[PDB]
């Protein structure tokens, strides 16, 4: 094993380490992005479910009003 | 100047390092694929909830026009 070949092996491997560290940094940051996205989506789901609950309530209320008005008309017909 | 042995160990160490960092990036890659799947399902859920909210919107409008008609009927009778 000649010292020149060894020194070049070291040079190459060190380049490699730097490269893969860059790639890992990239992946880590991307990971944080995906995580943020998951958070926002989950929040959006919670909001949508609150909206859905609100709609269920407004509609049930309207159905009871209709039931009442229909009942009234029923009385004005008999 | 560095010993052929010294160089051999720097090489040893660097190779261990590369293998380590590669394992780590593999881990991150798989974790990433997970995050993307998760995001997919969440977005799909958002689609279903928005469809449901649309359905509730239509039903809401139908109940409101029905309500208005009934009010009108009550007005014409008494
Ligand atoms: K070598
Ligand atoms: K290499
Ligand atoms: K890390
Ligand atoms: K060295
Ligand atoms: K090292
Ligand atoms: K890669």
From Swiss-Prot, chain A:
Induction: In ventral prostate following castration.
Boundaries of the shown chain within the full protein: 255 to 332 of 332
Task performed by this protein: Pro-apoptotic protein capable of selectively inducing apoptosis in cancer cells, sensitizing the cells to diverse apoptotic stimuli and causing regression of tumors in animal models. Induces apoptosis in certain cancer cells by activation of the Fas prodeath pathway and coparallel inhibition of NF-kappa-B transcriptional activity. Inhibits the transcriptional activation and augments the transcriptional repression mediated by WT1. Down-regulates the anti-apoptotic protein BCL2 via its interaction with WT1. Also seems to be a transcriptional repressor by itself.
Source species of the chain: Rattus norvegicus
Location in the cell: Cytoplasm; Nucleus
Subunit structure: Homooligomer. Interacts (via the C-terminal region) with WT1. Interacts with THAP1. Interacts with AATF. Interacts with BACE1. Interacts with SPSB1 (via B30.2/SPRY domain); this interaction is direct and occurs in association with the Elongin BC complex. Interacts with SPSB2 (via B30.2/SPRY domain); this interaction occurs in association with the Elongin BC complex. Interacts with SPSB4 (via B30.2/SPRY domain); this interaction occurs in association with the Elongin BC complex. Component of a ternary complex composed of SQSTM1 and PRKCZ. Interacts with actin.
Residue ranges of the region described as Leucine-zipper: 38-78
Record remark: domains: The leucine-zipper domain is not essential for apoptosis, but is required for sensitization of cells to exogenous apoptotic insults and for interaction with its partners. The SAC domain is a death-inducing domain selective for apoptosis induction in cancer cells. This domain is essential for nuclear entry, Fas activation, inhibition of NF-kappa-B activity and induction of apoptosis in cancer cells.
Protein's name according to its UniProt entry: PRKC apoptosis WT1 regulator protein
């Amino acid at each position: 094993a000649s010292s020149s070949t060894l020194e070049k092996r070291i040079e190459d491997l060190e380049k490699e380490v730097l490269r893969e560290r860059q790639e890992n940094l990239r992946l880590t940051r991307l990971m944080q992005d995906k995580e943020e996205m998951i958070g926002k989506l989950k929040e959006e789901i919670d909001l949508l479910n609150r909206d859905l609950d609100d709609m269920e309530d407004e509609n049930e209320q309207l159905k009871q009003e209709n039931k009442t008005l229909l009942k009234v008309v029923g009385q004005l017909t008999r």
